[PDB]
Design a binder for this molecule. Structure first.
Ligand SMILES: [Cl-]
Lengths: 100, 8, 274
């Protein structure tokens, strides 16, 4: 089994405005095998009941999924996606950065 | 429209 | 333009943990429009766009039956591959299939697809002529023979040139408003001072569809490659896409760099500067 390591981007659906309902996305791509554990974090803590797209895969066979949840950005609240996949010894965390 | 798949 | 109808099938064994997980996804032009999921409380093909909900109820039951046949088949396939490859029991393995047609704006077939991967690697594929197979390995040669003998290629040719094309048209006319639209990107540049005397210019493109776009940075009058980053194009989740490309330039020299955004929904490309 050739395993491939997921690539991750965390980012908002609309341009972030403190205090304004938005949507936060964790876009995870280029991984194999399909089994993967994704969690979205607020201030380090699991956000509850976040939505997952239908996993699919791309022309190269590699899998991908979009995880998303409502969120309202603040000055101090921080946000992150945490990915656990066989291809990696340890879970991988990527933080939401508002100019990315 | 999807069709049926051939077995391997 | 050109358009495509595509079916993506996934089967994942999970020994001990019950029967394989099985999924089919339909795409029109890269919009997901139908889906079949074995994990469903009551599995069956279902619509994935509001426009798919308008088709005859006859549509679904038939496709659900076809998917169920595909799922029982795929379960046998997983066992078959384990046997062809002489793989140890107890692990998880995956079969993937992609099949579809790509059609030019004149309604003609540009390309038909039929291909299979095992554990993420090419297994067998129908060649462009739509008559012969390419097996990636020894194991796939056993399927190649079975499939030749069963006259599979001709079944596939007929579907890809006929039904596949005919339904693409139904679907196109169906999702008319939203499939054929163009949303041009909204662009802007951000500005950041990093260590030493460096500045990061980030050229943003938002809210565009289709997904296809190009962003470039020009210094003086030619494009750049080093000191550059571009992220892979990504879904906003509402049917639009986002991208950015950044560049690192010397401090006080920001005015010499322009960003260019190229996209079909633009009367002409965008040029931005800080
Ligand atoms: Cl700054």
């Amino acid at each position: 089994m050739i395993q491939k390591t997921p690539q991750i981007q965390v980012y908002s659906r609309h341009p972030p405005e403190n205090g304004k309902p938005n949507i936060l996305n964790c876009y995870v791509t280029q991984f194999h095998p399909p089994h993967i554990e994704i969690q979205m974090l607020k201030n380090g803590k699991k956000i509850p009941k976040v939505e997952m797209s239908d996993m699919s895969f791309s022309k190269d066979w590699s899998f991908y999924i979009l995880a998303h949840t409502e969120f309202t950005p603040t000055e101090t609240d921080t946000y992150a996606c945490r990915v656990k996949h066989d291809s990696m010894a340890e879970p991988k965390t990527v933080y939401w950065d508002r100019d990315m | 429209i999807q069709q049926s798949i051939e077995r391997i | 333009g050109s358009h495509s109808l595509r079916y993506f099938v996934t089967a994942v064994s999970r020994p001990g943990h019950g029967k394989p997980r099985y999924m089919e996804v339909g795409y029109v032009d890269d919009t997901e429009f139908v889906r079949f999921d074995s994990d469903a409380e009551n599995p069956r093909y279902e619509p994935r766009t509001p426009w798919m909900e308008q088709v005859e109820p006859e549509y679904w039951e038939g496709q659900t039956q076809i998917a169920k046949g595909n799922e029982q088949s795929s379960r046998v396939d997983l066992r078959t591959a384990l046997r062809y490859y002489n793989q140890s029991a107890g692990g998880s393995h995956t079969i993937q299939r992609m099949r579809g047609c790509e059609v030019g704006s004149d309604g003609r077939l540009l390309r038909g697809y039929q291909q299979v991967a095992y554990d993420g690697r090419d297994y067998i594929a129908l060649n462009e002529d739509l008559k012969t197979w390419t097996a990636a390995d020894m194991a796939a040669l056993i399927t190649k023979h079975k499939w030749e003998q069963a006259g599979a290629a001709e079944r596939d040719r007929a579907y890809l040139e006929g039904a596949c094309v005919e339904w693409l048209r139904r679907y196109l006319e169906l999702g008319n408003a939203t499939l054929l639209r163009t949303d041009s990107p909204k662009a802007h540049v951000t500005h950041h001072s990093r260590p030493k005397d460096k500045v990061t210019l980030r050229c943003w493109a938002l809210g565009f569809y289709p997904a296809d776009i190009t962003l470039t940075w020009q210094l003086n009058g030619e494009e750049l490659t080093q000191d550059m980053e571009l992220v892979e194009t990504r879904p906003a989740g509402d049917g639009t896409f986002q991208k950015w490309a950044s560049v690192v330039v010397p401090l006080g020299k920001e005015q010499n760099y322009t960003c260019h955004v190229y996209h079909e929904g633009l009367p002409e490309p965008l040029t931005l500067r800080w």
